[PDB]
Amino acid sequence: QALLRQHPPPHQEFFSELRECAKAKGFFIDTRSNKTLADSLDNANDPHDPIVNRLLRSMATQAMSNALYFS
């Protein structure tokens, strides 16, 4: 008896086009764990432009799952 808040893991398909565009300018990423997701993200820092990080994490933020309550 309580009420908790979950984020069940995502699946590859919202990542597919993401990976595509990562596979368009340089960056190699992989999808096996939120640890290595976040790591292989935060390193990629395109030198001659600022928008890249914002934009990439924002399409990443169009990918993922939901947060809903349960007893």
Add this chain to the structure above:
RNA sequence: UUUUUUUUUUUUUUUUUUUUUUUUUUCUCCUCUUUUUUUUUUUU
């Protein structure tokens, strides 16, 4: 030196009654365009 007479303002009053807002039409009718539908997160 000029007398006498020719009516006037309809009579009547001591009758019972058990309803009720309104009121009566007008037909079927092509909604145009990046999408699956996004979604955690924190500061109110």
